[PDB]
Amino acid sequence: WKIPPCISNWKNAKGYTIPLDKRLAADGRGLQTVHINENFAKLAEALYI
Amino acid sequence: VKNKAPAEVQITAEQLLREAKERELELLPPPPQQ
Amino acid sequence: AKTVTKQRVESHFDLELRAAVMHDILDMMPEGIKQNKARTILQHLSEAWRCWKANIPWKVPGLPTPIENMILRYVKAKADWWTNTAHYNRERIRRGATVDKTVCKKNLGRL
Amino acid sequence: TMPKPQWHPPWKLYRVISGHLGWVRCIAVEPGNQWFVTGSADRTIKIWDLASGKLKLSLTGHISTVRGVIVSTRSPYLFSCGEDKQVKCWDLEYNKVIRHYHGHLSAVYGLDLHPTIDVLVTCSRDSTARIWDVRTKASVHTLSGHTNAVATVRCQAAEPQIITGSHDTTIRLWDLVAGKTRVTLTNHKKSVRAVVLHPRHYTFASGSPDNIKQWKFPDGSFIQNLSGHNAIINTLTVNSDGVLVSGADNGTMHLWDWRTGYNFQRVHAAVQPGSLDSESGIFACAFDQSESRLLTAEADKTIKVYREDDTATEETH
Amino acid sequence: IKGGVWRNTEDEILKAAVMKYGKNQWSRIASLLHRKSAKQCKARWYEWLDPSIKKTEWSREEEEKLLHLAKLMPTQWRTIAPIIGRTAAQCLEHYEFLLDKAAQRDNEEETTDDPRKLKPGEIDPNPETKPARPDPIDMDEDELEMLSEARARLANTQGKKAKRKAREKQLEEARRLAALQKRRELRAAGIEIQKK
Amino acid sequence: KKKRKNPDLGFSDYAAAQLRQYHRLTKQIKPDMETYERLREKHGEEFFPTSNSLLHGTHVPSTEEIDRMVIDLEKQIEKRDKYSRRRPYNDDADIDYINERNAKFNKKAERFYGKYTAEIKQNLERGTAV
Ligand SMILES: [Mg+2]
């Protein structure tokens, strides 16, 4: 039941300096996992043919 | 006369942070011994 | 006992949202908790609302799932309030009804 | 096994009413089973048809979330309260607000009507309960003495006439005439968010996330301890057949024997299609005047309607 | 009259300013670096300073997936780039390098076909994709003043009202010691003037 | 020869540390049998009282008892004041704070998020790569 602190991308009210790994610790935009489809291939190859 | 030449120190961000910590523009002095 | 008239509405909503979250985290913590740590969960909720408005996917790496679920619940509630207010003011701006200039700028910014 | 519990038939959902655009925070049934009110966080009050489940009217006028709604039995009125700080009387002859009750310093969480005097009582977040005359819209008394937000209040005609739990984990049994506390019951460990009155047996129940407790009325004696529904419970309601309903913030709802304190059914309902798993939750539940339908105001912006299963004993512990 | 080539001093002030202000305040960072705007600071961050930008050597499966996606999505480097995990400028540059290593082997030998098609007498359209000049020994008034302003703004956290209240507290302490000295003298010699 | 091991586990409660502290104080104390048998022979029947006997408002402790209590309580206050030992401050680590509170907040960030943000610090120290 421990609550880690809130390192915000917007508010720095007491003007602190936070290390980059703690600053860019937004996991959700790193696990977004840009994944492609397989029907791009059929389209591109058919257009070249 | 100003010389352009590649340096040796190559000042970094943590050096700026360390030299910024010692400015002390918010530490008020203690009250005098009254 | 001042009335929530027109310029107190968003401040009163965000005043009451914090209070509901405070009551829920005082009821949600188990029996042997130090009864601190309310301000941090409130900051996590404000940051989760900012990440909803920015369309940034919000995930805290270590966080208890009741706190995370409750924050997602109240962020969805504030999302609903925000969006229904935007729909209402857009219909008013379209029909030509009496609207403020600030609500026109706020509504453009929401849309 | 010291008691032997009465068999109650299990309940099942048969109707999911939808159409609010916010958490449905309150529900109440008309004295004639023709319609029922809901109030929600979309700042409206909706008259629903109780038989067909069809929206009968929508009443705008609140500036914030509607927290309590009640229909008067002596007079043709509809009292409602909100996070607005506004307490209103709706004349149902005209469907318009005729009287607004002013004086709450913060949000108003619940309200109840006295069954015989025409006196409204309200809970607020400013740690007070107020006592209003309907006809003169004035504060008779300000019940102060809780230290946190006041969550629920009830009324009798008989002794202690005002019973209120609050978020300071205490329950005060009051004097309507004097305006002072008679009994402070501190047995709960977490916040009392629902008190409920039995129609016949002159006892009451009270709920908090640790456990739920049953209590004699004159001075608050401990009688019993109903446990097992360990979540943040929001409402309790009593059937004259001795069925007690406990609905929680996590959507779980338990069905209980009033007398023996036995859990005969657990109901974990499912959310609406668009809704989210973290959004299952019950804020209100109420029986109709026939006491054969259970109306639950849910956190997925729904009204779920339950009735008894007509299949015989497959049950008894 | 903004931009140009990025030096190491500006990039380190940019790193420290991202450490202080975050990746959603670029006009507060670009106030710390003159001759650089907020769009330029943002672009320099996301194109050479983010520690997810793989500045290492291209592997084999990376350039295989590169050729597959570039044949697969023609001239769509902002779409190809998050898939293969590189900056779109690096992705385009390495693709042109791989096409050069096939066109040169297929037709030519070293030269012969048009010696230079590079860019003379011009300003480079994307100088944020290029590595940083080192710092010259004799830093001028601009660079040293920029470093001094950088340290003086990385130190500060207080606003107007806190700074006037600290000075007001020091003035209250000074006038308290002064009235203390006056009252101590009036009680030492002995003169019983009462106050209001 | 005797040997006893008593390390500490995690905190988990304000009552468990109280219980540990009470067992320490209550094992350190030594009873005096002379004063005990004296007060026993003086008090007689009521020396083994119930919840409700009579003596609640009677006892007047002499100076030596209250002096022993005050000295013991001063020792207990000292043992309480030695609870949070200051860790030694090295200035060789690359400092990432401009204030006095910023250092402790960065320490809390290294406590909580230090297990998860272990790749990005490696990326920073190798030159913003990988
Ligand atoms: Mg300013």
Curated annotation (Swiss-Prot), chain A:
Belongs to the SNW family. Identified in the spliceosome C complex. Associates with U4/U6-U5 tri-small nuclear ribonucleoproteins (U4/U6-U5 tri-snRNPs). Component of the minor spliceosome, which splices U12-type introns. Interacts with SKI, SMAD2,SMAD3, RBPJ, RB1, PABPN1, MAGEA1, SIRT1, FOXN3, U2AF2, DAXX and ATP1B4. Interacts with PPIL1. Interacts with VDR and RXRA; preferentially associates with VDR:RXRA heterodimers. Interacts with NCOR2. Interacts with MAML1. Interacts with NOTCH1 NICD; the interaction involves multimerized NOTCH1 NICD. Involved in pre-mRNA splicing as component of the spliceosome. As a component of the minor spliceosome, involved in the splicing of U12-type introns in pre-mRNAs. Required for the specific splicing of CDKN1A pre-mRNA; the function probably involves the recruitment of U2AF2 to the mRNA. May recruit PPIL1 to the spliceosome. May be involved in cyclin-D1/CCND1 mRNA stability through the SNARP complex which associates with both the 3'end of the CCND1 gene and its mRNA. Involved in transcriptional regulation. The chain holds residues 245 to 293 of 536 of the full protein. This is SNW domain-containing protein 1. There is a cross-link at residues 14, 42 (Glycyl lysine isopeptide (Lys-Gly) (interchain with G-Cter in SUMO2)). The lineage of its organism: Eukaryota, Metazoa, Chordata, Craniata, Vertebrata. It is found in: Nucleus. It comes from the Eukaryota. It comes from Homo sapiens.
Curated annotation (Swiss-Prot), chain C:
It is found in: Nucleus; Nucleus speckle. Widely expressed. Plays a role in pre-mRNA splicing as core component of precatalytic, catalytic and postcatalytic spliceosomal complexes, both of the predominant U2-type spliceosome and the minor U12-type spliceosome. Functions as a scaffold that mediates the ordered assembly of spliceosomal proteins and snRNAs. Required for the assembly of the U4/U6-U5 tri-snRNP complex, a building block of the spliceosome. Functions as a scaffold that positions spliceosomal U2, U5 and U6 snRNAs at splice sites on pre-mRNA substrates, so that splicing can occur. Interacts with both the 5' and the 3' splice site. Part of the U5 snRNP complex. Component of the U4/U6-U5 tri-snRNP complex composed of the U4, U6 and U5 snRNAs and at least PRPF3, PRPF4, PRPF6, PRPF8, PRPF31, SNRNP200, TXNL4A, SNRNP40, DDX23, CD2BP2, PPIH, SNU13, EFTUD2, SART1 and USP39. Component of the U5.U4atac/U6atac snRNP complexes in U12-dependent spliceosomes. Within the minor spliceosome, which acts on U12-type introns, interacts with PPIL2 and RBM48. Core component of U2-type precatalytic, catalytic and postcatalytic spliceosomal complexes. Found in a mRNA splicing-dependent exon junction complex (EJC) with SRRM1. This is Pre-mRNA-processing-splicing factor 8.
From Swiss-Prot, chain D:
GO terms for biological process: mRNA splicing, via spliceosome; positive regulation of G1/S transition of mitotic cell cycle; protein localization to nucleus. Keywords: Acetylation, mRNA processing, mRNA splicing, Nucleus, Phosphoprotein, Repeat, Spliceosome, WD repeat. The keyword RNA-binding does not apply. GO terms for cellular component: catalytic step 2 spliceosome; fibrillar center; nuclear membrane; nuclear speck; nucleoplasm; nucleus; Prp19 complex; spliceosomal complex. It is found in: Nucleus; Nucleus speckle. WD repeats lie at residues 19-58, 61-100, 103-142, 145-184, 187-227, 228-266, 277-316. The modification Phosphoserine is found at residues 18, 208. Belongs to the WD repeat PRL1/PRL2 family. Involved in pre-mRNA splicing as component of the spliceosome. Component of the PRP19-CDC5L complex that forms an integral part of the spliceosome and is required for activating pre-mRNA splicing. As a component of the minor spliceosome, involved in the splicing of U12-type introns in pre-mRNAs. This is Pleiotropic regulator 1. It comes from Homo sapiens. The chain holds residues 184 to 500 of 514 of the full protein.
UniProtKB/Swiss-Prot annotation, chain F:
It is found in: Nucleus. GO terms for biological process: embryonic organ development; gastrulation; in utero embryonic development; mitotic G2 DNA damage checkpoint signaling; mRNA splicing, via spliceosome; positive regulation of cell population proliferation. There is a cross-link at residues 30, 121 (Glycyl lysine isopeptide (Lys-Gly) (interchain with G-Cter in SUMO2)). The keyword Acetylation applies. Identified in the spliceosome C complex. Interacts with CCNDBP1. Involved in pre-mRNA splicing as component of the spliceosome. Belongs to the SYF2 family. This is Pre-mRNA-splicing factor SYF2.
